[PDB]
C-alpha cells in the first residue's frame, strides 16, 4: 500500500517563516510520519516556502489573513490573485498524479471544493471551530464525504456542531529533535504560551513565589507593560524571561525545568507544551481545561488542578517528586509520536481511498 | 443538434425583483430565444424567484452584495452559505444532464471554478470592468478557455484588459413588446438619462429650444436644483419631464417622438436606449460615443454627431425627414432581436461544446 500523496499548506505565511504557527510543523511532521512509512508526498505552499522534508513545490499569490482575527465569522474574504486560489488551481491541474489530497489550510475555499475534484481531500483542522462558516462547512462537508476532516482533541471536536462525525487523530512530534533531560541542575518552574492579561501567567507566578522556585517564562512579549506588572505584583518570585523561541530553543531550555506550569484562565488551546515537556522529561502541573485533561495524566505524567486554584498549583508543586521524568517521556513514545500518528494518518486514508474508489 | 442548457442567474436578488438589474431581463430573453430555436433550458435562481419562461429551480441562501457597490475591490467577499456556491454546488450535482452551463454572475466564483467543471461553460459579462479583481478572472479565464466569455458590445469589451479575446454576442429583446409607431402626432424630441450635472442633458436643451421641438425626458429627478435650473438657462425650449417609467411605460411613449436625443459626455458602453428607440421606429441622433457610433447608423437610422456639437445636433433635426422610421425598426429586426440573438447564443454554444469534447 504504497501512496502517493499531495499535501497542501497554509496560505499564511511560508514554510519556515513561522507566520503559518504549528500548522507548519504538523504538516512536516504528518510528511516525515507518511514518508517513514513507504509513502510519497509532495508539499503545496506559497513563494518562499523551505522544507528540508520532502519536495515542495511553491505556489506565486497574495498571502491570506489568518483564520484567528475572525472568530464567529460568517465571511469568505480571498484577496486578489490569492496563493490559496492558485495553490487548489495547481492542485486540480495534477491530481491525477497522486492517490489523496491532503489539506492543512483553515479556510472555505478548500472544503467547498472537494466534491469538485475526482481525488479524495483530506483536511486537517488546526483549531476549534473559531468561526461558523468552517462549522458549516465542515458541517456540510463531512455530511458529503464521511470521515473527510480530522482533529487533534475532542476538545476541538466540543466546539464543532458535528464533531461527531470529526476524525480524532491526535497528533506526533518528532521525539529525535527533544533532549530528555533526566534530572534538572536546580529546581525551577516553566511556563510557556502568549504573555496577556488574561492567559493566566499571573498564577504561575504566585506558585513561583510560594515555593521558592525560580519561574522560566517562554513566549512573546506582546505588552511589554503587561509584563513589567507580573514582576511587581509577585515581587518575590525569581521570574526570568527566556525569549519567543523555535522548537529547538524552547526545548534546549525546557528540559531544565522541574515541571511546565500551564494556568489558563479559559479553555486553552497553546497546548504542545505539554506534549513537548513530556518530550523532554519535564511533568505537567495544569488546570482542568481541554484538550490537558486527556494528556496530563494524573499522579503519573503530571497533576491536574482545579481551574483558578492557585493553591492547588503549589500543592501540586510539593508533589513533583513523586512523579517519574521517564513516564512522561514514555507516555509521548507511546502517543503523540511519528511512528505511531504514521500509522493513524496511514489507516486513516487507506480507508478514505478505498471508501472513496 | 437541439441541446438542454442550465442557466445560472445572478445572485444579487431575485428574478423579477428587479434587484438584479437588466440582467434579469437579459436572462429571461436568452432563455426565450434560445427554447424557441428548438433548446431546453433550466433556470438556477435565488429564493423568490419567479419566471414565466421555462423551468426554474430556485436555491436558498445568503444574497449577495452588488458589483456595482464594490467598485475597484481587490477582495472577493461571500457571505456564509452564500446563494452564489449553493448555486454552483446544484450546477456540479447535475453537471452530467446538460451540454452547457450559462452563467450570468458578475463574481469571482463562477469564474474561478469553470476549469472544475467536466461541462463546457459560457459566462455573460452584463457590465464593463468595475473592479481589478474582476478584470483579473477574465483574463485569466479566457486564456484558460478560449471563446468561453461574451459581452455585448465592443465598448464594453474595450474596458478589459483582453477585451480583445472576450465573445461579442450583442443583445437581444422582444420585438413584440414595443409598439412601432409609423408616424408621431406632434413633432418633438426625447432624452432618456439620468438627470444629474455633466450628463449632457443641457446640450439637449439647446438644441430643443433652437429647433423649437419640445423635449421630452425620461429619467430620475434626483436634484430638483438641476431641474429648474434648466428651465431657467433654457426659457423658450417647452421641456417636459415624463418620470422614471419601466421598459413597457417608456417605449408606450417613446414611440411618439421624432427623434431620440443621446448626449453622453463620456465613452458609452452600451447605448441601449437606442435599441429601444428603434424598437419604437424613433431614430437616433447621438454623439459619436463608444457603442452607439456602432448601433446609429449614420443617415440611415439617425445622425452620429462629433462629440460635444450642439450645432450638429441641431443640423441633424433638421435632416430628420430623410430618415425612414421603418429602417430603425427594420435593424431591430435583422439585429438586436431575440431572433437573430437566439441564431448567434446557438451558433456560439455549438463552438463550445464541440470543442470542449475535442
Redesign the interface.
Known amino acids: 500500500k504504497k501512496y502517493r500523496l499531495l499535501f497542501l499548506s497554509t496560505p499564511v505565511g511560508a514554510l519556515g517563516s513561522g507566520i503559518g504557527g504549528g500548522v507548519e510543523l504538523t504538516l512536516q511532521n504528518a510528511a516525515k510520519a507518511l514518508m517513514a512509512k513507504g509513502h510519497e508526498v509532495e508539499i503545496v505552499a506559497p513563494e518562499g516556502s523551505v522544507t528540508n522534508v520532502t519536495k515542495l513545490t511553491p505556489i506565486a499569490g497574495n498571502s491570506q489573513v489568518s483564520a484567528q482575527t475572525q472568530v464567529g465569522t460568517?465571511?469568505?474574504?480571498?484577496?486578489?490573485?490569492?496563493v490559496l486560489?492558485n495553490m487548489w488551481?495547481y492542485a486540480?491541474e495534477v491530481q491525477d498524479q497522486f492517490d489523496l489530497l491532503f489539506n492543512f489550510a483553515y479556510d472555505?475555499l478548500p472544503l467547498?471544493?472537494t466534491?469538485?475534484?475526482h481525488r479524495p481531500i483530506a483536511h486537517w483542522i488546526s483549531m476549534s471551530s473559531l468561526s461558523?462558516?468552517i462549522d458549516?462547512m465542515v458541517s456540510k462537508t463531512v455530511k458529503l464525504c464521511p470521515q473527510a476532516i480530522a482533529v487533534n482533541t475532542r476538545a476541538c471536536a466540543d466546539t464543532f456542531s458535528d464533531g461527531d462525525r470529526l476524525m480524532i487523530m491526535g497528533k506526533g512530534i518528532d521525539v529525535t529533535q527533544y533532549n530528555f533531560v533526566a534530572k534538572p541542575e536546580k529546581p525551577s518552574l516553566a511556563w510557556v504560551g502568549r504573555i496577556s492579561p488574561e492567559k493566566g501567567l499571573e498564577d504561575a507566578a504566585e506558585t513561583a513565589q510560594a515555593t521558592g522556585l525560580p519561574l522560566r517564562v517562554f513566549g512573546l512579549i506582546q505588552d511589554q507593560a503587561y509584563w513589567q506588572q507580573i514582576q511587581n505584583d509577585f515581587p518575590k518570585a525569581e521570574i526570568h524571561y527566556e525569549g519567543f523561541l523555535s522548537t529547538h530553543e524552547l526545548q534546549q531550555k525546557l528540559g531544565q525545568s522541574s515541571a511546565l506550569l500551564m494556568t489558563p484562565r479559559w479553555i486553552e488551546a497553546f497546548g504542545n507544551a505539554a506534549i513537548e515537556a513530556f518530550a523532554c522529561g519535564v511533568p505537567v502541573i495544569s488546570y482542568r481545561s481541554g484538550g490537558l485533561t486527556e494528556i496530563v495524566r494524573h499522579g503519573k505524567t503530571g497533576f491536574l488542578v482545579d481551574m483558578g486554584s492557585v493553591a492547588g498549583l503549589i500543592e501540586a508543586v510539593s508533589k513533583l517528586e513523586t512523579i517519574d521524568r521517564l513516564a512522561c517521556r514514555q507516555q509521548l513514545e507511546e502517543e503523540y509520536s511519528l511512528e505511531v500518528w504514521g500509522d493513524r494518518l496511514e489507516k486513516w486514508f487507506e480507508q478514505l481511498i478505498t471508501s472513496y474508489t
Not at 460568517?74 to 490569492?82: A, G, K, N, R, W
Request: proline residues 14%.
Open positions: 460568517d465571511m469568505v474574504v480571498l484577496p486578489q490573485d490569492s486560489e488551481s486540480r472555505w467547498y471544493l466534491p469538485f475534484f461558523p462558516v458549516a
